[PDB]
Amino acid sequence: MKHGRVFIIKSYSEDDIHRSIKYNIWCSTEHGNKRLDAAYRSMNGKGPVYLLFSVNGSGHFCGVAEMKSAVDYNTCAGVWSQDKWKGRFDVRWIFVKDVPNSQLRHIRLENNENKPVTNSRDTQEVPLEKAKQVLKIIASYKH
Numbered sequence: 563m564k565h566g567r568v569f570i571i572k573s574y575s576e577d578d579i580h581r582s583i584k585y586n587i588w589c590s591t592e593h594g595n596k597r598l599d600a601a602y603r604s605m606n607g608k609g610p611v612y613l614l615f616s617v618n619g620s621g622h623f624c625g626v627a628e629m630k631s632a633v634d635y636n637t638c639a640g641v642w643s644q645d646k647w648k649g650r651f652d653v654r655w656i657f658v659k660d661v662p663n664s665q666l667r668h669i670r671l672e673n674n675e676n677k678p679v680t681n682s683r684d685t686q687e688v689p690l691e692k693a694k695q696v697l698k699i700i701a702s703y704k705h
C-alpha cells in the first residue's frame with residue numbers, strides 16, 4: 563500500500579461546495595485538474611488522494627473528501643457558480659465540519675516556503691507528515 567497524497571482545495575463559492583457535498587463531484591482549474599489527475603493516476607488505486615476544502619475568506623476549513631475518479635475534461639457546461647470551471651471528477655466526502663484556521667495555522671509546509679498550511683492556494687499539495695497533523699486536528703476538533 564501507499565500513504566495518502568493530500569491537497570488543499572480552495573473555493574470562492576460556498577454554493578459550489580454545497581453542490582459538491584450533495585452530489586460527490588468536484589472540478590478545479592485547468593492546471594489544478596491536471597495536478598490532481600496526475601496524482602490520482604500515479605497512485606494507481608494503492609492509496610487515497612485526500613482533499614482538504616476551505617472557502618476563501620471563511621477563516622475555517624469545512625471538511626475532507628477523497629478523490630474517487632480520474633478527471634473527465636469534457637462534461638456538461640455551466641453547472642457551477644461560474645462557467646470557467648470545466649471538467650469533473652468524482653469525490654467522496656468523508657466528513658463535513660468547520661475547523662477554525664487558528665487550529666491549523668502553526669502547521670507550516672516545507673514545500674511551500676514554510677508558509678502556514680492555512681495560507682495555501684488551490685491544489686497546494688501537503689507533505690505527508692504535515693497532512694497527518696492537519697487531518698488529526700480536523701478529525702478531533704470540538705466546538
Ligand SMILES: Cc1[nH]nc2c(NC3CC3)ncnc12
Pocket residue numbers: 572573574575578588589590591618642643647684
Ligand atoms: C467548482 C470550483 N472549483 N474551484 C473553485 C473555486 N476556486 C477559487 C480559487 C478559490 N471557486 C469557486 N468554485 C470552484
